[model samples]
Structure formats: C-alpha cells, structure tokens
Target: SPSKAVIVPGNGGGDVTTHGWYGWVKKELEKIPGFQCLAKNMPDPITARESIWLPFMETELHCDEKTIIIGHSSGAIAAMRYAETHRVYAIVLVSAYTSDLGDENERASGYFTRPWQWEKIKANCPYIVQFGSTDDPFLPWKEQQEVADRLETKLHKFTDCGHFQNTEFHELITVVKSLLKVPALEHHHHHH
Candidate 1:
C-alpha cells in the first residue's frame, strides 16, 4: 500500500474561490511516488478537530493501524487530537497552532480540552514538527520551541519559512523526505 496523507486545511472554510491548505498539499504530495494525499476542509476551528481525522479513520479513509496523517496550522492540533487516540503510524505536523481554540479568555489548547477525545489515541507514532523560522503569528522561535517541547518534538525549523503554506513551502518536499523515520509502505509491509 502507498502512504496515505490526509491533509487538513487550516482555518480556511474550503472556499472554491481560493487555494487553501488542501490544494497546496494535494498538488505537492500527488507528485511523490507511492504517496496518496487527501484533504478535509474545516468550517470552523472546533469542527476541524471533530471532523477532520476521525471521519477518515472511521469511514471514507483509514490508516489501518499504520497510516501517516499530515496537518497544517490548526489542523495540526486536530491531528494530534486524533493521534492521541487512534493508531496513526506517523504524523507530519506543520505550523501547529496552540490547541486552545475553544478558550474564550485564552488561546492555548482551545475547546479541544476534552480528555475523552484523546482516549482512542496513543503517543507511539513517530512525528515530525515543521515550522518556518519566521512564522506562526507573533510567536518567536523560542515560543515555538516551547510548543515543540510539549510535544517532545525535535523541531525541524526552516529558514525564511513563514507559516505552513505558500511557495515558501515548496521546499517542504525535502523536509518530508529527510525526517520520516520509516516510510509507511515499508512499515506496513512489515506489519503483515
């Protein structure tokens, strides 16, 4: 089987009028041999966490206990939410936002604080954290590193890479190739 990557667009409302996260990711991943890419559009931040990954896992697409999930921006938080429960083989996190979307007075962790949602996942999947050296809103490199610390990430920082989208990310192909500890196909083959 090929590596399945469900690329969830950021806060973009899936406007056909614009090329958001989904379009950017799909076009790139489709070029990779043996890699399949798909996308989920979020109506809002909360729905992004609720709908993006689980539906794919339960219905249209599934990881089969060893799937790679790729998410950008707030979607990255959603991916982690799903990963904490399901058996995702690996996670490629891009420009992750703090999971505090639901908080009224605050912004870190958001309404995704429901611990039960994390019940189906485990922290076992190998993960890659990709962030631009100069992206993530007002967050500086140090602040981003703090977020990485919570995830225990190795922190794959890019030079002049702001945020997770746009042409600046074309070089992300190199990052993906370099960081994946094991390809999903090879790992799946060994599982059976």
Candidate 2:
C-alpha cells in the first residue's frame, strides 16, 4: 500500500511551501513509487497551539497508521503530542526541544503545559528519528538530548546547522528515503 508523508512546518505565519527545505523534501518524496507527500500551511501559525495543530494533523492531513510525520521545531513538538495516542508508521523530528525555552510564545503553544508521554509516543510509532545540533541558537543541547534519550530515536547530532533553517537538507532526504526503502536514483549516477 502507498504510505503518506506529512511535513509539519514550524509556527510561522505564512505558507509552508515557503518555509526552508519543506517544499524540496516534499518534491523529493513524491518521486518515489509508493509514497505520497503533503506539506501545507498550518492554522494558528503564530503560537502553534496543540489544540489546533493536532486536530489539523488528524482531520485535514489524514494521518493514520501508514503515515510518516516529518516535523520541524514547533512542528516537532506537535508530532510528539500527536503520536501519543494516534498510531503512525514513523516520525522524524528536526530541531526538537522539550521545554518552552523561556519564551512566552512557546509557552502559549500549550505543548509544554503538561508532561510529555514518552512511553506512549514510543508505543504508538515504531520508527523514530531525530536531528539536532549542539549549537542551535533557539534550542539548548540539553533539551534536545533529553528528547533523544526519552524517545530512544536514531539521533543525528551535529555541531553546526543552527535551527536547520537552510533551504536544502541532504541528510534529511537520505534518512527519509531509507525509511521508505527507495533507491537513491537521483544520486546513483554520481559514482565516485
């Protein structure tokens, strides 16, 4: 059966297609034979309140047992909360954090209000991967490590790549393609 891949963007008031690396990843995933990708602008973009984004992920995005969620920053937080109850195939978190980082906007998002159900998240999703950086300006290394430890994900820790705001992310593409079991046709011709 064909699987779905949902790219959840960070909390920013604009089209998700305009966000860094989202559109590129979506396009790349869609080329696979048995994969469907969706990257849409989220509602309540400023705060990214859990109340709004979770349901949107369920009802609008149609996340199900065969869905693979690719979440970034605040979107990563949303993916963790969503997976607590809903069953999904896998989850890929980029620039994930545990706390609100002393920011009022983050605190208002409602994700940090309650304790994270790490066990439930693991129980729901079979495969989990996380990408974090030691020098992320917004998220501290400790919080990112805590998430990795609790989720027991295949962590890809980097020294640079602050906030992962670049327009192109080759590592992310490689990881997702591996999960889908798709051959690297695009790079196949560049044999060294």
Candidate 3:
C-alpha cells in the first residue's frame, strides 16, 4: 500500500520555509489522513546536479516503493529520473520541462544528459500527473507538452501560473486528496 509523500523542491538553495511551491504544498498535504509529506532542503541548489540530488533522495530521503514523489521545477525532473529505476506509488510534476532548454546550468544538472526512459517510469508507478503553465517565464509550453505526451499523464494545464511559485496551491491539494481515495489501477501486478 502507498505510505508517505516526498516533496522535492526546486533549485531554491537554502531553506524551503517561506516558499509556497514545495513547502506550502507539503504542509497542506500532510493535513490529510493516511499521508505524511516529507520535504527537505537539498544540496547543490544552484546547479541541481542529479548525482548529488539522487543519492540524497535515495539515502537521506529514503524514497521507497510505497513513496509518492511530489516534485516542482528541477525537482520535477528529479522525480521522473528517480521513477526510471526505483518503484514509487505515484509522481506529481509541477513546472516540468523536457530538455535543458539550452542552458549550461541545466545541462550540468545531468538529468538531460541521457535519454529519458518514460516507459520505465510509467511501468514503475501506477499514477503519473503533471502541472504546467502556458505563461511560464522559464519553460516553454512545447517542453511541458512533450513530457505529458510521452508519459500520458493527467495534465493539469494552467494559464498564468509562472513557475508555480505561489504561496497557495489548492489545486494540488485537491488532486492529491483524490488520489488517496483511489486504488492503484494502472499498477501491473499479477492477480490470482
């Protein structure tokens, strides 16, 4: 059965205390029964290197088969990468992008260095959801659309949410709440 919810923040460096993206959403999601959200201050905040972050997520964060990863921005990409190998209950991606967007810093992150195993992620997790904004200041709509199309995720397309950096996100809470009540339908487990 699904257990904990892991909230991975974007490359905000330092604490995620005042941020609404990860911190606020973590707090709100924890209020629900049968769910415990875990959000941490990650390392290499500026570059968001996958080598550093992935180890932290595995060892420090302890993401397991029963874990649900809620990722934003760089965190979103991290969640997708993690799902490629490890098994998780589900994944929620916010402000998710496909490529490095021709940025040296993003290229240094190491996630886009390899081909994305979208099929692996879907096979591992029962549910995949994505949040995107048409007016995002950083990522283009085409990038977000590419990810959604590849994963065949439940896309929550928005209009003016710039990077989803707001302090309040009721829509996220609503989706999570709905997920809790439903079974893992897409999970490919043998039934006797």
Candidates' lDDT values, in order? 0.54, 0.88, 0.85
- Which ranking of candidates, highest lDDT first? 2, 3, 1
lDDT of 2 by residue, 24-139 (tens): 88888888877789988998999999999999999999988888899999999999999999998889999999998989999999999989999889878778889999989998
Q: Per-candidate TM vs. native?
A: 0.68, 0.92, 0.92
After TM-score superposition, the amount by which residue 58's alpha carbon in candidate 2 deviates from its true location, in angstroms, is 0.1
Displacement of the residue 190 alpha carbon in candidate 1, Å: 23
RMSD of each candidate?
Answer: 5.9, 7.4, 3.2
TM-score of 1: 0.68
Candidate 1 global lDDT? 0.54
Colliding pairs, model 3: none
Clashes of each: 13, 0, 0
- Candidate 2 accuracy as TM-score: 0.92
Which segments of candidate 1 are over 4 A away from where they belong? 16-18, 43-53, 56-58, 99-111, 114-122, 138-143, 179-192
